[model samples]
Target chain A: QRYISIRNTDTIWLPGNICAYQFRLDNGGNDEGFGPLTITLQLKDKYGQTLVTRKMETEAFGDSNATRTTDAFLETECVENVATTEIIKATEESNGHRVSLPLSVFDPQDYHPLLITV
Target chain B: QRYISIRNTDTIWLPGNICAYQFRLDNGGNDEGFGPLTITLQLKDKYGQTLVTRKMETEAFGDSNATRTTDAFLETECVENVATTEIIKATEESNGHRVSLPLSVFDPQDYHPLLITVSG
Candidate 1:
């Protein structure tokens, strides 16, 4: 069975105090087709509490280059209280492909954007 | 081939001058499973020009009662200029099911919400 692949920003800078994340979802090529994918993406605060959850779905897979993309944003006062946030989990129910990669969150004022590279 | 079903509010009141539309999408049951559905919903102004476009997707069909729901909102100054707006079209590419229904838009200030029942 072919699997759905996912990619997202490593660190999201909360410009204007808004949490914005850019994500890319791909159906892994034509060797085998995976369709009707239901993807659940979640984010958590430093205490491991759920901050944001998003459900995204896509049609069957075909070409490798044709990937789906969307932006998820959380505009809430709760973001300010936490020192950090992370993308705790992402799962595709159709093929059972799951991935969890921690994504760092920061405020532009508290942390300098330029210092990220250093 | 089974088809996808859609239902939405007939008239969306711009409470606080914000456009909010609630929609429901359903898979037409288990006889046929239509998967990987891509649905495109559009809104147009009185002049029939595109105002907003949203792309939504769903897996396959099974239980009739299990439907997907979402809310679409457009926050812009252009909404003030239009006399009315309509949901121009909605299309599901996986099964080629298409629907077009006109929806009325109004500002709660200019047009009172209670008066709609009398005027309409």
Candidate 2:
């Protein structure tokens, strides 16, 4: 029952003055590889307000090759300066603890229909 | 046959005009908590040559927490400036592909007799 893999090397527009987004979550589970895990990335803007968050702890091999690098910033001070930009994203799998990710946003930066293939 | 464990936290006196000695090697094998290991420590002086050598690499769970730091220097001309020390040493531990760490040198401002204890 090993099913979970996300890969993106193309199709990314992400404009809106980019409050900030450098989210990299990797651990294609089910024990084929990916061992040491400590992933935490939370950013709830648009009134829900959590603003930004980060946590990527690693020490792996029996020890694991754990890795994490978070930099998520999303704050749109009440909408108005619409020159160009859009975002609403979410991700989950806090290997060591929490998991509940489902967020999205879209506009005119590139291609979008909410494509999450494989 | 889980054999390999060496420990020493204190009791070190090495001061003979202070040539230099800062070595630390760790990897207590046989399943006792020292896994990710890349230990390399070699320092020889007293005219056997090879004054310094260092190599510690790690990536273990399948990758390790490797550690290696070596700073061993000893040089003397031979009597005359006899206002000073004594020599002759050995040390060897290259746990990755090489292991023959036998280097020693003694005489302290307090007390020392060539003690070789590099364990992590």
Candidate 3:
């Protein structure tokens, strides 16, 4: 058996209502990229529309055992109430000096980011 | 004085660590619009980049006192840890048949969402 996919993470700026999650390049799966990588992300809405696009230029992993996505920070925080656990669409692209990093991962139990906002 | 800002709202789908908020078309401030309106929104990141854009075509207010901000639902739910009281940037736009609806409101105290995750 294998543990694959993202789980809850930790950070300092979150409130009582929001939650954080992170998917590591080396959680328990393929564990690609020996060191130094860049990850870009494109978030989409329910209607298959591009919501936002962002990227991390280059991050130097301290060692192969490092699991932090890019930095020691929460990747993204989501609204816990307005979404079902299966309410997100992402195209995560990765580039590194050593490994060819590319794959589609799965989200955890019952936590998605957005369905409503003011 | 006047209660002229967003307050924590109730929703069914929210987790314990997540919360919801809504800015009604008629709360306490200048309760504008007689009936039927539309609302649009744009969310941004901390670096001032547009994160997402959405809109509401038209919603009918039952009466002068009927409020629901186009719908009787939570407008948004934020993380409980990853943000401060001032963690969001939004440009809420509105359009309707009568009475102009526009204003920049304030958030509540010590309840900003987003900052942490995967707690023990």
Candidate 4:
């Protein structure tokens, strides 16, 4: 009875013609592996109203120590003024950990690629 | 003779069709103001070889507590494998302070806009 655990909720902010909300998932040591899991991400404003919801089914993570990373490509207009993002639900998650992370959409004019960690 | 001081070298990472190297400058309190100053930014690799040098002249910053924010747009291919960014030189300085800031260009696919600060 192994469930999935989101090891880190570090949101990668990809600003472009479309923005991507990327997150990582850990298989929680399930020998049988996990997914074709349906994952849902919700974007919200400061007032707690839902701005947008993105859902996707990931390719199955193989057995034992397997991890998967993927993102939801979103329209810039849809995510404008979005304050937070939450992984509200996942395929086998009765493990009781819902992940929420703060989002920042400031300085659209200022642009640079992700800093290559040296 | 008040010199220009780079108050914070916080580089803004804006990933789009083209990348920009944006930085901030402070007037360091010369009442008469400063500039049309020439500012240069040099991107270098891990071995300390110059990858690219971008130079721009700022519009004059007005006197007292003046600060200017600007960026130099750069080609993505030019900055590929760049390890660090430095304000190698600027106008009116012999100020004894040279600024160098680390640059990270990891995960080009991940993108997000800048975070807006909440106001009081």
Among all candidates shown, the one with the greatest lDDT: 4
CA lDDT of each prediction against the hidden true structure: 0.36, 0.28, 0.35, 0.43
DockQ, Cα level, model 4: 0.03
- Model 1, B1-120: lDDT tens digits are 444334332335565665444333344333344434444444445464565655545444543334322233333333533333333333333445543322221111111011000000
Model 1 Cα lDDT, one tens digit per residue, A1-111: 444344332335565755444333434333544444444444444454555654545454543334232223333432533333333333333445443322221111111
* Residue lDDT tens for model 4, B30-109: 45565355656566666767777766455556465424233233333433566555555555322443333222211122
Give the TM-score of candidate 2 (chain A).
0.21
Q: How close is every model to the real structure, measured as TM-score? A: 0.26, 0.17, 0.26, 0.33
Q: Model 2 chain A: which ten-residue window has the lowest total lDDT?
A: A109-118
Of 3 and 4, the candidate ahead on DockQ is 4
Per-residue lDDT of candidate 2, residues A2-110 (tens digit): 2222211121235664332222233322233333334343333334444444443332212223432112222332332222122233333346744433222111122
Tens-place lDDT per residue, model 2, B42-88, is 33333434444444332321123322111222232222122222222
Angstrom error at residue A35, model 3: 1.7
Select the stronger candidate by TM-score from 2 and 3.
Answer: 3
Docking class of 2: incorrect
DockQ for the candidate 2 complex?
Answer: 0.01
- The A-chain TM-scores of all the candidates are 0.40, 0.21, 0.37, 0.52
In model 1, the Cα lDDT at residue A30 comes to: 38
Q: State the DockQ of every prediction.
A: 0.01, 0.01, 0.02, 0.03
Q: Tell me the native contact fraction for each prediction.
A: 0.00, 0.00, 0.00, 0.00
Candidate number with the higher DockQ (2 or 4): 4
